[PDB]
Scaffold this active site. Structure first.
Site, PDB file in Angstrom:
ATOM      1  N   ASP A  23       0.882  -1.327   0.109  1.00 29.94           N
ATOM      2  CA  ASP A  23       0.012   0.251   0.084  1.00 29.94           C
ATOM      3  C   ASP A  23       0.911   1.474   0.066  1.00 29.94           C
ATOM      4  OD1 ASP A  23      -1.805   1.930   1.007  1.00 29.94           O
ATOM      5  OD2 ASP A  23      -2.846   0.883   2.370  1.00 29.94           O
ATOM      6  N   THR A  24       1.075   2.072  -1.145  1.00 31.05           N
ATOM      7  CA  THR A  24       1.942   3.571  -1.027  1.00 31.05           C
ATOM      8  C   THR A  24       1.075   4.138  -0.238  1.00 31.05           C
ATOM      9  OG1 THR A  24       1.008   3.619  -3.345  1.00 31.05           O
ATOM     10  CG2 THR A  24       2.872   2.533  -3.510  1.00 31.05           C
ATOM     11  N   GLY A  25      -0.214   4.800   0.218  1.00 28.08           N
ATOM     12  CA  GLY A  25      -0.684   5.013   0.870  1.00 28.08           C
ATOM     13  C   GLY A  25      -0.350   5.023   1.776  1.00 28.08           C
TER      14      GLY A  25
HETATM   15  C1  BZN Z   1      -9.052   2.704   6.040  1.00 26.46           C
HETATM   16  C2  BZN Z   1      -8.980   3.164   4.892  1.00 26.46           C
HETATM   17  C3  BZN Z   1     -10.181   5.073   4.837  1.00 26.46           C
HETATM   18  C4  BZN Z   1      -7.920   4.567   5.097  1.00 26.46           C
HETATM   19  N1  BZN Z   1      -7.307   4.988   3.600  1.00 26.46           N
HETATM   20  C5  BZN Z   1      -7.230   4.354   2.494  1.00 26.46           C
HETATM   21  C6  BZN Z   1      -5.387   3.113   2.922  1.00 26.46           C
HETATM   22  C7  BZN Z   1      -5.258   2.498   1.482  1.00 26.46           C
HETATM   23  N2  BZN Z   1      -4.012   3.033   1.415  1.00 26.46           N
HETATM   24  C8  BZN Z   1      -3.572   4.394   2.475  1.00 26.46           C
HETATM   25  C9  BZN Z   1      -4.314   3.603   3.802  1.00 26.46           C
HETATM   26  C10 BZN Z   1      -4.173   2.590   4.843  1.00 26.46           C
HETATM   27  O1  BZN Z   1      -3.589   2.858   5.420  1.00 26.46           O
HETATM   28  C11 BZN Z   1      -3.761   3.422   6.998  1.00 26.46           C
HETATM   29  C12 BZN Z   1      -4.390   2.973   7.785  1.00 26.46           C
HETATM   30  C13 BZN Z   1      -4.607   4.349   8.710  1.00 26.46           C
HETATM   31  C14 BZN Z   1      -5.147   3.822  10.152  1.00 26.46           C
HETATM   32  C15 BZN Z   1      -5.853   2.212   9.873  1.00 26.46           C
HETATM   33  C16 BZN Z   1      -5.138   1.403   8.805  1.00 26.46           C
HETATM   34  C17 BZN Z   1      -4.539   1.430   7.387  1.00 26.46           C
HETATM   35  S1  BZN Z   1      -7.505   6.597   3.763  1.00 26.46           S
HETATM   36  O2  BZN Z   1      -7.928   7.338   2.433  1.00 26.46           O
HETATM   37  O3  BZN Z   1      -8.043   6.322   5.037  1.00 26.46           O
HETATM   38  C18 BZN Z   1      -6.188   7.281   4.155  1.00 26.46           C
HETATM   39  C19 BZN Z   1      -5.218   7.505   2.834  1.00 26.46           C
HETATM   40  C20 BZN Z   1      -3.562   7.558   3.241  1.00 26.46           C
HETATM   41  C21 BZN Z   1      -3.286   7.691   4.138  1.00 26.46           C
HETATM   42  C22 BZN Z   1      -3.482   7.403   5.237  1.00 26.46           C
HETATM   43  C23 BZN Z   1      -4.976   7.290   5.317  1.00 26.46           C
END
Ligand code: BZN
EC number: 3.4.23.16
Lengths: 99, 99
Positions: A25-27
């Site tokens: 996961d690059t995000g």
């Molecule tokens: C579960 C989902 C709502 C979280 N988000 C996306 C996921 C997919 N890649 C980054 C994030 C996972 O890793 C982050 C994560 C944070 C808390 C719990 C599990 C995963 S996000 O769009 O809120 C986000 C995007 C980019 C950075 C941070 C969040």
């Protein structure tokens, strides 16, 4: 290898002597693992996204093998439905984004 | 291009005549942008996030230019910590992960 995004980029990882599925996961800044036992002490942490935050336990210097590449670093353990390999370990294995 | 991951892969995107910064997120199924107005029809949509589902607005067949690559597809607009480009559009610009 080269991993397609037509589907979620799920690969097999090994931790301890345990093999699991995980999302490259690059995000994600950090690596987040599903609830499991690891030895040693941890630090409390909160991590969030769309929706809000979960409580996780931060372990350092944890070995994760990814397609034969050994990465060692911080992992966050908590109630995630999927193991997430974040940039802290993707960098170590030489993972890049290409288009 | 080739993008390494020692930092967040934030890129400039052009959408709806506007320049934005967005995160290239292989962990995201969908593209989700901060509150903005876009032309055309939209429908309410629930998306799965941390600890629950979130209300977003779904706009279909929207043009977005990422790193100079054209994509036309679904963009969700709602409360996200950062603009994220998910696989639905990353596949359109030819993105893969490599190591
Ligand atoms: C579960 C989902 C709502 C979280 N988000 C996306 C996921 C997919 N890649 C980054 C994030 C996972 O890793 C982050 C994560 C944070 C808390 C719990 C599990 C995963 S996000 O769009 O809120 C986000 C995007 C980019 C950075 C941070 C969040």
């Amino acid at each position: 290898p080269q991993i397609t995004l037509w589907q979620r980029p799920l690969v097999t990882i090994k931790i301890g002597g345990q093999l699991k599925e995980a999302l490259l996961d690059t995000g994600a800044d950090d690596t987040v693992l599903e609830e499991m036992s690891l030895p040693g002490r941890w630090k409390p942490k909160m991590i969030g996204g769309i929706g809000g935050f979960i409580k996780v336990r931060q372990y350092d210097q944890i070995l994760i093998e990814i397609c034969g590449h050994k990465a060692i670093g911080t992992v966050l353990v908590g109630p995630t439905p999927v193991n997430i390999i974040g940039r802290n370990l993707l960098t170590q294995i030489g993972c890049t984004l290409n288009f």
